[PDB]
């Protein structure tokens, strides 16, 4: 089924009654109301478009304000379009609570990662540091050789080099869900999900069953 846009709220751990402790991530997942049910008429494909959160009305833009008061939904932060699965079918403005994750047991939380910045190759691609004594000169962390010689005559496309690491979008897969709460609107998933606190985690039921 569809996914749910929530917010990352830190990490904690839950002690089971029988003895183990599980590191969980708390995700506050508000109401994800639909602003546009796309279907095969004007798009060829079918989908929904959800929103959540809130903004100041003197901070939202006049195109987007008409895009939200078209549906009557309160203009929040972002929009996120989810692909439909031919069995479930929503309408415009139909709010979607946290209670789609009752019977499910595995999720795929996707969030924008934490940008480590311009990382060099040791931290970025796990290269190996050269010998930091024994004659070595000015070359303790540099990435070594990058190509062969006169026959290749260039570097191959997709050479692992240095540069921006993180602040990408990644996907943790197949997390065992822990506990879903109604009034608190919290989705406890086991283990780390990407991004620092305040991210926008899209949580959908896991495709690898």
């Amino acid at each position: 089924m569809i996914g749910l846009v929530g917010k990352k709220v830190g990490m904690t751990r839950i002690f089971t009654e029988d003895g183990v402790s599980i590191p969980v991530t708390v995700i506050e997942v508000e109401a994800n109301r639909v602003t546009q049910v796309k279907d095969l008429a004007n798009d060829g494909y079918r989908a929904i478009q959800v929103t959540t959160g809130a903004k100041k009305a003197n901070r939202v833009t006049k195109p987007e304000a008409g895009h939200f008061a078209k549906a009557g939904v309160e203009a929040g932060r972002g929009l996120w379009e989810f692909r439909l699965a031919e069995g479930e079918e929503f309408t415009v403005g139909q709010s979607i609570s946290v209670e789609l994750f009752a019977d499910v047991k595995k999720v795929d939380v996707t969030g924008t990662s934490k940008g480590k910045g311009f990382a060099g190759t040791v931290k970025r691609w796990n290269f190996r540091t050269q010998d930091a004594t024994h004659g070595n000169s000015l070359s303790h962390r540099v990435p070594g050789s990058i190509g062969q010689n006169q026959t290749p005559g260039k570097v191959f496309k997709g050479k692992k080099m240095a540069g921006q690491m993180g602040n990408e979008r990644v996907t943790v897969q197949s997390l065992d869900v822990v506990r879903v709460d109604a009034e608190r609107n919290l989705l406890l998933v086991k283990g780390a999900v990407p991004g620092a606190t305040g991210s926008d985690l899209i949580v959908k039921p896991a495709v690898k069953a």
Binding site: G10, T12, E28, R184, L186
Partner: peptide, 12 residues
Amino acid sequence: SNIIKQLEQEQM
């Protein structure tokens, strides 16, 4: 958070 401290203090 409020959420973490209240979900925390209900298990301490």
